[PDB]
Structures are given as C-alpha cells and as structure tokens.
C-alpha cells in the first residue's frame, strides 16, 4: 500500500502540552522502518512547520482559534498535495482539532470519502454548545454540512467548507458525550456504536455494520480519523482525555485490519498521543507501541501472519 | 426515576469487617448528587440504624442469625415503605445477607416481581449446606418456597416468607459455586447464566435470555440484587469474596443500561462494598466509582450520552 | 475422568531456561490433589529422566536436536504407554518441542485423534525455515503428513513418522506468525482461528467450528497442545514467549470446559510454564495458578458448579 507520510506537531486545540511529540514519538519508535518491512511503499513529507500566530487570542469561550485555525488549514494543503500523488495520507498528530485540516484536505481530491471516527467521544461540540472552548473537541462540527449555519464565523476557520454529511460519518467507541453533543448526535441521525453497542454487537457485527452503512450504496475512499483515547486507558494511557471502559487491544487491531481488507482506506490519522502525559515511562511506551501496531495494521500487518506471492520452501 | 435510598451499615453476614461502611464511602463519592443531576427525583431515607442483639448466640453453625435476621427484618420494613411511597428502593449495605429484607420488603408491595441477582456465588446455601455458617452466602435460600421445608427455623427469621419461586430468578457472572449449591440450582430448574454463559453467548444475548424468560409471559417489577464481587476484582477489588474471571466493567454497565430500559427496574441493591478491604487506597476508590457507575447506569446514566426533551442550541 | 500423569523437565527446545521447573511448580501448586477431590482417578507416571546426549551438536542453525529428539521419543514410547492403560495422557513440562514425542506416542495407540493447538505461535517453522534454529517453534513441521518431503534427517528424530494431516488439526490464538510460517500455514489449507478470528466470531462460535470440524465426520479421541503463551500475558506473563493481545482468563476457560464436555480429550500438554520468568514472585504464582485451572477445568471443573449423582439434603 502506497503511503504519504505528514506529520502535525500542533497541541493549541487542548490545555495538555506534550502531544505535539506525537510525530516524534511514533517515528523514534520506527514507525517508518516497520511499514517499509511491511507491503508498503512510504514516503515522509516531513512535520509540517506550523508558525507562530500573533494576534491568537480567544474568540469567546474559543481557545487559541487562529492557531488551530491555520494549523488545519495548512495540514489541509499538504494532505490535498499527498492525495493527488495516488498516496494514502498518513497524519501523526497533536490533538484531535487537526482533523479538520486532515479531513477537508482529503475531500478536496476525494469528495466521496466515508469517515470513521475511533473516540470515546464525538468531538463535536459547537464553538456555541462547548464548556471547554478546547477545539480539539470540536472538530466534527466544523467540517458537518447539516451544521452550516449553527457555527459562528471563528477567527482562523473562514478556509473552512462542511465537506461532508452526517450519514457519510460513523462513530465506533463512545463513553463520554456532553449533552449538547448527545442532542446533535441524535438530532442529525448520525450512525454510531458506543461502547454499549459494541457490548451488545461484539466487533465483528460493529465492523460490519459500520462498513455496510457507509459502502453499500457504492464503494468510496475511507478515511480513518483515530483518536488513541478511543481504547481503554490501560493500552493506551499516555492521552489527554482518558475514559475506563474502552476498545480493548484486540478490538482496536480488529477493527483497523477490517478496514484495511475493505481495500478502499484513503485518509488515516493517528491523533492525541502525549508522550508526556504517563504516569510511567513504561505507560509512554506502551501507549506508543499501541499506536504503532494499529497504524501498522491498518497497511497489512494481520494477526494470522503475513507474507508475498511466491515459493519460501525453494 | 424516582428514588429512594436506605444505607444498610451491615456486616454480620460475613467474617471480615469494613463492610458496614459502604453506605458511607457510596454517599461519600457523591452518590445523592450524581442521582440528581441525571434524571431522577432522589429522596434520602438515612442509614437504617442497627440496634445490639443481646443474646445473639450462634444457631448450630449459622453464626450472628438474631442480628442479622434482625437486620433484615428491619431494612424490609423500610423498603417496603419506600415501594409504598410510590419509589424504587436503593439499597446501600454491607453483606449480601440484606437481601433477605431488600426482597422480602419489596414482594409485600409487589408480590409478582423478578429477580436479577449479579454475582460470582449463588448465596443460595441453607442454614443445612453451608461450611461457614456466614449469611450472606444464604441469602437466597431463605426466599424460595421451593425450599420452605428444607429450611431450619433459625432464631431471628421468624418473620421470614419465601416471597419468591425458583422461576422468578435469573444468576448472571456465577464462577464460585459450593458442591451444596449446585446441586439445589440445577434440581430446582433455576435459570443462571455463569461466566461459562457469559463467554459462550456475550452479554448481549445474555441479557436478552434473562429480561426474555422473566418478562415474557407478563410485564413485572425487576428487582436487581448486585453484589460487586460480580464483576472482576480487576475493577472491584475491594470487597470480601474476591473471584478471577469476571464481568467486566463494560459488561456490569452493559447489564444496567439494559435493565433501566426496561422501565421495570424497582428495587436494587448494591451490596458487598468493603472500603477497608484494597490493597492500597486506590483499590479502595475504583471499587467504589465502579459502584457508583453502575448505580448510575441503573437510573438512565448511558454511555452514548444523555439529554432531555428541548431545543439546545436555542 | 482417568489420568496418567507424565513429568517432562526439560528445555533444550529453546534458549531460556527455567522451563524444566514446570512439572514441579505445577506439582507444587497441587495439581494432583486437585484433580482426585475433582471428579478424578490419577496416576502419576513420575517425571521422565532425560539424559545427557553427548555429542548433542548444533545440526546447522537447529540446535540441541539429539537431545530435544531423544527427550520427545523418550515421551513418545511413555505417552503411547499410559495410553495403553486406558488412560487420558497428562504431559507436564517444558518447551512445546515436546509435543512431538507427546503426539506421536499418543497416535500409536490411537492413530485418529485430532489436534487442538493453544498457542499465540504456529510452531510449524521447519528446520530450513526457522530463522531462530529453535525446536519449541518447529514441533508441528515434524508431525505432519504433508511435510514428509520437506523437511530435512535431523539427528535425533529417525523414530519420527508423521502421524498427523494439515486436516487434522486446529489452531486457536495465532497472533504472532512468521512469514515462513503463514506460507506453510495457507498453503496447506490448514484450519486456523486468530486472534482475528477469536475477535470476529466469538470464543463460543470458535469453539463450535473447532469442534464441528474435527468431529464431523466422526467421533474421534482429541489431543489438546496447550502453549500457555496462547493466552495474553496478564494471566501468564511466566512463559518465554509472551505475546500481547492474547486469550483472556475466562477464554482459556471456556475452551477447555468445551473440550471437556465433548467427552473425548484422550491426550493433554500443558507447555512452555517458566517458573524462573517472572517479573515478580506474583506473576509466577498468577501463571502457574492459572496453568493448573485450565487442567482442572479439561478434567470436568465448571464455572457453574459440580457435584455427583446423589442426594445431597439426605
Ligand atoms: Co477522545
Ligand atoms: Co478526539
Ligand atoms: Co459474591
Ligand atoms: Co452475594
Ligand atoms: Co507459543
Ligand atoms: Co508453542
């Protein structure tokens, strides 16, 4: 599978610093050098060099607006650029805002696209429903069509475009929505499996609901937006938003190499990772060496073993 | 929902003390408030007030029966107030032994209810099969008719009743069951699903087999007896009877959110927390928030979110 | 259920040692006793003395073969003795190299059993694909029918014979395959259920294709190779091969219930228990602990309950 690496150093959209080493973290740990192994042509287009923005005050309960704003819009830019070169675009974050950038860049080539979104929650909080004013909770509404007229105009997001449809997005792991969330998620009809209906369902049936509500109509590119705290904290404890009773390690591995055998995974972003943020050094590495084995899944990596379309024995 | 909350500061069911401070360390995380801001109309009956029972010898091998009869005897007078004040009863305790006044109290005002007992024993030795003598492992016996003549008197349980049959109970999470137990379970035809049930069938199905086999003639009030030692000491360490295996803590709120959907939910029991017995603080705390969780889940708290009937965003 | 017992001390099939103690902390923990208090009739066939092989050489990259050879054939004509008895054989020992000696004696007697392989690995690495030149990861290769051409005369296994075919055996908890492996794996059409699998279908849908598959056609006597690495090392991190995302404590124990209950488990290996590869004295007491409720539970243990056929309130 032929990847484009970008990587998005940028924290502005939470209050928890560290997860702007995201990028540095998941490559010191040899993420470029285990998809190479892998079947996987790669090609890093660096950490995009996100500038200083004077002015950034906050607009509102809105924290540091511009910055994020023109984080995502940059990222936006280089991820259009990767998608043109026929690559999947592979995003190494800070927190979770940047998909704003991540997801609009990619419909800019691939209008079509279907999300699935792994978080314990809908970051889609209004700059008008948020008690945080953090945007990294927030990105979903952005990029929402059926929200084009219920979100202020932010300092920072004019660039912005609702590029795509509340039944072109599916939740897996939720466990921890805000209210104004809750009445949005049901409003709109979005299709979601909270950790309830994982429960209920087991993954596999998730998996397949999840694909046959998004491609059954017709088959489209598929972008995987994964926030880390979508597992439990006990895989994946170095994040700024933690919640018990998430993804285990297996269904976060069972639900990546599903998506990769669907052959149509288009857009994938791994954000949230704070290396900063364990209370030993062993919960950074395991929190790291997670986000690692599930980015490598998502390319081939399968569970069963793996290997080419020749003669071993000779 | 409307509530009524009884703390029952018990612990002569069993050997090991700190059980009776249950009621306390439940209050203590919150309880009364995170009740109230959910959706439920919540009303404090205090903590039953245990008196001294003088002679309070041991009956053969039973030991403390007087007290904990006595208990008993008491905390079912008072459940059956609160039914009567139009409320479902929420009983905080010590030892599971309180079951036989929770139940016993909630059948007067509601003959035909059902029971849902979560826990990893059957509590249902008679005074006849035990080895310990301890109560709360015998709880159950004391409410069958069918055993209503395989029952010794035993002082302080003279105002007892089997209120209910072998067929108005369902055992959810079993994995430590005495020789004695087994045999009464599988003669009397009770249905049970053990952990055995649990990993075949998923808790999804599971729940389906238990609401499906208690409701399905006839819509009935649901009593849930939960005995955290349910669940897997991972998540509920603190507490007397420990056993490996266990519901997880996903699948403890997987079981509440499904009984409160049922609208049926109208007695519940929240039994063998014991806050002196983690091995450091912190074991202490994620029994008690874990106990609180599912209390939450039982009265409409939901995983995927909440909110109530109105426009949000104004 | 009757026993024989088989103590195989030793390790030369891999480079940790420690792996001979097995037989003796599983003896230690009270496995036999356990067993007769069980429904069972145990005889213990002492532990095999293996002795040293003298010019026990390297054979190009594989290593200790004579002594590994000798050690399985020495099992072999044990095995094929207990088997003789009327008895289900009961291998305890060291590294999964042993499961030659332990499946070949057992398809002497009984020449149309039917393999259940437990295991995080596929041990089916032959000589000239095994990049580690160790022979707990190669055990497979040398019993199949299918490989009898394609593996090279290593010194110490001239007794051996392929007693088994690609279709006569099942894999449960495959998550960490080499290529080699999965080339031979595939090709052979051999039936398998990862993690993958595991994750999809659920433990009891997997039980039941395991079971459907092998028993389908016939009844037949079942050998069960349990690697304790098969299971995730949280429950047995005192084991040399410790994958992550294995199966949990309660998966263990309902494959080994359902085993039970086919009421053909003719043959038994209970491998790769290190003793000396602990973190701390706990996590070798949890792995050992957890060793002997998988044997209890292949010999009748139930979550449920047991008893025997009588009357127990007289
Ligand atoms: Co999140
Ligand atoms: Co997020
Ligand atoms: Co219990
Ligand atoms: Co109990
Ligand atoms: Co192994
Ligand atoms: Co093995």
Same mark, same amino acid.
């Given at each position: 599978?032929?990847?484009?690496?970008?990587?998005?150093?940028?924290?502005?959209?939470?209050?928890?610093?560290?997860?702007?080493?995201?990028?540095?973290?998941?490559?010191?740990?040899?993420?470029?050098?285990?998809?190479?192994?892998?079947?996987?042509?790669?090609?890093?287009?660096?950490?995009?060099?996100?500038?200083?923005?004077?002015?950034?005050?906050?607009?509102?309960?809105?924290?540091?607006?511009?910055?994020?704003?023109?984080?995502?819009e940059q990222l936006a830019g280089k991820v259009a650029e990767v998608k043109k070169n026929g690559r /999947?675009?592979?995003?190494?974050?800070? @927190?979770?805002?940047?998909?704003?950038?991540?997801? =609009? *860049?990619?419909?800019?080539?691939? #209008?079509?696209?279907?999300? /699935?979104?792994?978080?314990?929650?809908? @970051?889609?909080?209004?700059?008008?429903?948020?008690? =945080? *004013?953090?945007?990294?909770?927030? #990105?979903?509404?952005?990029?929402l069509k059926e929200l084009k007229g219920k979100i202020p105009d932010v300092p920072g997001f004019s660039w912005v475009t609702p590029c795509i449809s509340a039944k072109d997005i599916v939740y897996i792991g939720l466990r921890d929505v805000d209210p104004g969330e809750h009445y949005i998620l049901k409003t709109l009809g979005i299709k979601y499996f909270?950790?309830?209906?994982?429960?209920?369902?087991?993954?596999?049936?998730?998996?397949?609901?999840?694909?046959s509500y998004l491609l059954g109509r017709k088959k489209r590119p598929i972008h995987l937006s994964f926030d880390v705290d979508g597992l439990d904290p006990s895989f994946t404890p170095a994040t700024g938003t933690p919640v018990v009773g998430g993804l285990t390690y297996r269904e976060g591995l069972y639900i990546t190499e599903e998506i990769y055998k669907t052959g149509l995974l288009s857009g994938?972003?791994?954000?949230?990772?704070?290396?900063?943020?364990?209370?030993?050094?062993?919960?950074?590495?395991?929190?790291?060496?997670?986000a690692v084995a599930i980015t490598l899944a998502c390319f081939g990596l399968a569970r069963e073993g793996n290997h080419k379309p020749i003669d071993y024995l000779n």
């Open positions: 599978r032929t990847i484009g690496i970008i990587g998005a150093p940028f924290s502005k959209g939470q209050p928890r610093g560290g997860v702007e080493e995201g990028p540095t973290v998941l490559r010191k740990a040899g993420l470029l050098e285990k998809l190479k192994e892998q079947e996987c042509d790669v090609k890093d287009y660096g950490d995009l060099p996100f500038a200083d923005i004077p002015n950034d005050s906050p607009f509102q309960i809105v924290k540091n607006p511009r910055s994020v704003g023109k984080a995502s /999947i675009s592979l995003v190494l974050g800070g @927190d979770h805002s940047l998909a704003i950038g991540s997801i =609009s *860049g990619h419909a800019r080539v691939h #209008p079509d696209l279907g999300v /699935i979104w792994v978080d314990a929650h809908t @970051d889609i909080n209004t700059p008008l429903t948020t008690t =945080s *004013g953090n945007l990294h909770g927030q #990105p979903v509404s952005f990029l909270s950790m309830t209906e994982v429960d209920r369902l087991g993954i596999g049936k998730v998996m397949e609901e999840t694909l994938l972003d791994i954000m949230e990772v704070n290396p900063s943020l364990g209370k030993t050094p062993e919960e950074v590495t395991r929190t790291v060496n997670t």
